[PDB]
Design a protein around this ligand. Structure first.
Ligand SMILES: *Cc1cc2c(nc3c(=O)[nH]c(=O)nc-3n2C[C@H](O)[C@H](O)[C@H](O)COP(=O)(O)OP(=O)(O)OC[C@H]2O[C@@H](n3cnc4c(N)ncnc43)[C@H](O)[C@@H]2O)c(*)c1C
Ligand SMILES: *[C@@H]1O[C@H](CO)[C@@H](O[C@@H]2O[C@H](CO)[C@@H](O)[C@H](O)[C@H]2NC(C)=O)[C@H](O)[C@H]1NC(C)=O
Ligand SMILES: *[C@@H]1O[C@H](CO)[C@@H](O)[C@H](O)[C@H]1NC(C)=O
Length: 498
């Protein structure tokens, strides 16, 4: 009996399933569902939700669930694009880590211990409250949890300078399938490597990350300028942007959010500079005069204030609120990574289809900088030198447009088909934090599939990790040979050991 086991093991914060919309269960369940595509009355629901309040409670929670027949699901921020943190094709128990959100900062070693329920915003806020000369590289989305984010890499506006979030992890507490509490020394370098980008929900439950805090100026510079132009000018802006974005010095980042709310397009250029406005403006006057950036556009502020700004927030304090939803639309998204420059016709066609769909968006980021200097096998994220751009295709819709779902999905699929010849090939690359099930999936309940799991999973595995896929399988076998931690695209162990 799970409730008996949990009670005896001192795990008191738990709620069983209830169909009552007003129950604590239903509220907790939906509190961290960040993609409404997976909220509806259909879709798998957990038999119980458990909120461990300590690493020991997390350890025993894992032990208890497993004594039953249940599949374990871990949820930090709940931002899984495919809702893999709170859904399962088999009966499951949901471990919600929201009560594990403590940040301990050591200003002397300039490191920090971060409980895996902590959101990026909670982390950013905690850093500012301790220092104005320190920051950390990760996503702009403040409600994204460190649990899944760092586990899958973690790309952000400072990654051209400092690489991924996972690239700056120096230790971690990992709790395995037996509840064993392990640090870097205990888990070994192969497992410690795998958790730094190998994908969440595969290796065990990360209790906490030990991260290196990174030097930032007292004042940095950001700007957000939107250009409402025609497809023809937009195409030329984007065709030049790709070179600027990648070629910029590592102290710079220029990102693009694109949409066509009509059949003209809008382009929002987002810029960041580790320094003051004069060096920032001088650089873009030179490299990108077409943006029409003036002195008034360059805003100086603290690092924390900049990330609050880039997140579309008003104050630094709003970073420390994990339940703040500025958007609440269902969505599906895909991503490409490029090796060769995109011809002008690539952007043209992309914007063309964008105009045909007002609920469609794109997000564009250049790599280069330090992303080119980090070895491809430093951590599981393989897309380093030779990788030019990350291109995200998104379609999102509210509760009014629900019936147009299959329409929206057909659009995205065709956008993706169109971009096929211009982006990476053999294999077509992906990013594990941009988990995409269109690429396929494993049924761990089908014994035929499971026995050939490695070669079946090699499809998406090499797309996410390339040649790092092989080492990940070994690390999986070291830490979870019986595959207690699994989902449709989780790394398979060396064989079926059950
Ligand atoms: C919603 C959202 C996602 C974003 C955004 N912007 C991003 C960006 O600028 N850069 C990025 O690199 N990624 C961005 N993403 C995507 C997120 O990076 C991913 O969606 C993260 O994986 C989200 O992490 P989290 O919020 O924790 O997602 P969950 O659904 O809770 O978990 C995902 C996955 O990880 C496993 N897992 C969670 N917690 C743990 C622990 N402690 N240990 C092991 N495994 C864990 C889950 O089981 C699940 O499988 C911008 C926005 C708005
Ligand atoms: C289980 O954990 C939740 C989350 O921390 C607890 O809920 C919080 O309770 C405090 C005060 O009791 C409120 O200020 C918070 O707003 C609550 N959070 C949420 C998300 O509702 C809950 O009390 C815990 N339950 C038990 C039995 O320990
Ligand atoms: C199990 O998987 C194999 C291969 O994917 C398939 O041929 C078989 O029909 C599946 N079994 C069931 C019951 O679906």
């Amino acid at each position: 009996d799970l409730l008996s086991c949990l009670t005896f093991n001192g795990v008191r914060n738990h709620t069983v399933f209830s169909a009552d919309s007003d129950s604590d269960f239903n509220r907790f369940l939906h509190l961290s569902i960040q993609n409404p595509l997976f909220q509806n009355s259909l879709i798998s629901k957990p038999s119980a939700i458990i909120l461990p309040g300590s690493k020991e409670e997390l350890s025993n929670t894992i032990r208890c669930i497993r004594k039953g027949s249940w599949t374990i699901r871990l949820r930090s921020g709940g931002h899984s694009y495919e809702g893999l943190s709170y859904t399962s094709d088999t009966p499951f128990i949901l471990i919600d880590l929201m009560n594990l959100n403590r940040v301990s900062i050591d200003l002397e070693s300039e490191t920090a211990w971060v409980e895996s329920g902590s959101t990026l915003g909670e982390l950013y806020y905690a850093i500012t409250e301790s220092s104005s000369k320190l920051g950390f590289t990760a996503a702009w989305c403040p409600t994204v949890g460190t649990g899944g984010h760092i586990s899958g890499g973690g790309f952000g506006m400072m990654s051209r300078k400092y690489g991924l979030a996972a690239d700056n992890v120096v230790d971690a507490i990992l709790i395995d399938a037996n509840g064993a509490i392990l640090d870097r020394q205990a888990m070994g370098e192969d497992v410690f490597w795998a958790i730094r980008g190998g994908g969440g929900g595969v290796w065990g439950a990360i209790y906490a990350w030990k991260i290196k805090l990174l030097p930032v100026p007292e004042k940095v510079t950001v700007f957000r300028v939107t250009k409402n132009v025609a497809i023809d000018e937009a195409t030329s802006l984007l065709h030049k942007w790709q070179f600027v974005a990648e070629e910029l010095e590592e102290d710079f980042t220029l990102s693009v959010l694109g949409g066509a709310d009509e059949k003209q397009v809008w382009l929002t250029m987002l810029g960041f500079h580790f320094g003051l406005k004069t060096v920032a403006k001088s650089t873009f006057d030179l490299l990108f005069p077409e943006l029409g950036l003036v002195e008034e556009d360059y805003l100086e502020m603290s690092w924390g204030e900049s990330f609050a700004y880039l997140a579309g927030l008003e104050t630094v304090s709003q970073l420390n609120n994990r339940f703040l939803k500025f958007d609440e639309r269902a969505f599906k998204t895909k991503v490409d990574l490029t090796k060769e420059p995109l011809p002008s016709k690539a952007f043209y066609g992309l914007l063309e289809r964008l105009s045909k769909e007002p609920n469609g968006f794109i997000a564009l980021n250049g790599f280069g900088g330090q992303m080119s200097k980090i070895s491809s096998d430093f951590t599981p994220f393989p897309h380093r030198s030779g990788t030019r751009l990350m291109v995200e295709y998104i379609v999102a819709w509210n509760q009014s447009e629900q019936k147009k779902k299959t329409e929206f999905l057909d659009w995205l699929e065709k956008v993706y088909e169109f971009m096929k010849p211009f982006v990476s090939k053999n294999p077509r690359l992906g990013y594990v934090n941009h988990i995409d099930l269109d690429l396929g999936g494993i049924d761990w309940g089908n014994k035929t599939v499971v026995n050939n799991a490695i070669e079946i999973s090699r499809s998406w595995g090499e797309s996410y990790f390339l040649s790092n896929y092989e080492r990940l399988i070994r690390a999986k076998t070291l830490i979870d040979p019986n595959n207690v931690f699994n989902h449709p695209q989780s790394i398979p162990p060396m064989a079926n050991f059950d």
